[PDB]
UniProtKB/Swiss-Prot annotation, chains A, B:
It comes from Escherichia coli (strain K12). HAMAP family: Adenylate_kinase_Adk (MF_00235). AMP binds at T31, R36, K57, L58, V59, G85, F86, P87, R88, Q92, R156, R167. Belongs to the adenylate kinase family. This is Adenylate kinase. It catalyses: AMP + ATP = 2 ADP. It comes from the Bacteria. Residues 122-159 are annotated as: LID. PANTHER family: NUCLEOTIDE KINASE (PTHR23359). It is an enzyme of class 2 (transferase). One of its GO terms (biological process) is nucleoside diphosphate metabolic process. The keyword ATP-binding applies. Changing K13Q: Drastic reduction in enzyme activity.
Amino acid sequence: MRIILLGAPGAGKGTQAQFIMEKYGIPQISTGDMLRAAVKSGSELGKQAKDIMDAGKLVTDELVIALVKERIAQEDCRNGFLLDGFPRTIPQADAMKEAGINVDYVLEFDVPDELIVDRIVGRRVHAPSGRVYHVKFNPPKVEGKDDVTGEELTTRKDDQEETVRKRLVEYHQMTAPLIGYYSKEAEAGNTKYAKVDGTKPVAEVRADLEKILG
Amino acid sequence: MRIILLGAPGAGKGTQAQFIMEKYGIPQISTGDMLRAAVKSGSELGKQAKDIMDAGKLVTDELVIALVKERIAQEDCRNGFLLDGFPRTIPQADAMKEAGINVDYVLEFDVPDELIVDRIVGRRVHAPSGRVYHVKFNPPKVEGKDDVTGEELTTRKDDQEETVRKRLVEYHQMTAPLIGYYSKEAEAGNTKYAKVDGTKPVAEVRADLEKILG
């Protein structure tokens, strides 16, 4: 089973990953890890990657596709793999197909921007420990306070409604054509594409995936 | 002892790094290493940087200076540090100053473009082993053939003359004003700048370094 899991930054698609790994006996792959690991164990590619990163340059799609084709080449990817958030663009998806890397399913985990904004802006944290609290969800037992230390909660620069709304627009303008690319690949019959309403309770999303994947 | 080590790609400034660490008891910090270390140790900035990398986004100067301030705060930098190839621009250098990160020395490891071009374009490699030869410097016994397998050698894409000469121009247009920035600073008495002839015997360069650093 080779699956591509797409979802907005903050949509919560990872919630369903452990489930997918445990059902199919496949590992989860992200290009970020993949890069950190290849540099570590100096291989040709990882040496090429390490150089670019050290020079403050962006890694070429050319390197990334080679590292993926290299990774999925292992024993652990015998049963398949769960590629988390890659590809990010059509040339990357195309480059994957040309190198013969095919996937059975492309799952788009869908949560509305308003709901993602909500899940994020209403988030408090105990600065000194990074302990998270969420005003509507998991509030601190003691309002505005760290149940443990007692010390008052702060908000992360990153969870600002403005910053959050910018990430989303960017994400959407980047991902829209890729989604269209996949839906047609599916119409073509080269893969299966599925949207997953991630607003549902986790147990229902899980049931939805079992129905979608077999 | 706080030293910034500058040098064109291919000049071999790394050759004198062990000496510097061994003489002053300071570590080598490079942004690629530092980044890859913030992520792992899920600290506030590390998390910020892990997402950026993972999203295939480029790390902003702002986040980079933050990792350097965090990093050099580690106890292993209690004697100073060797910052290898960073800053890369006046904007980056100026920010380090503003954050209170002063440096005693800025060394520019100098090796003429042509010599670097010659040191690189003329190298053949045995792909499935990584063995490297240089038509002039370390030719294979059977020229054009790998000595251990009797298998043909190749040239890396990077080693290509067109690619090499482009990297160097790119490097020079970018580093020319930084060098100039650091000389004005040196003249202002804020740091010491020194140019090192990297075309000398390693033993001579090392000798020179001691007469510059003490």
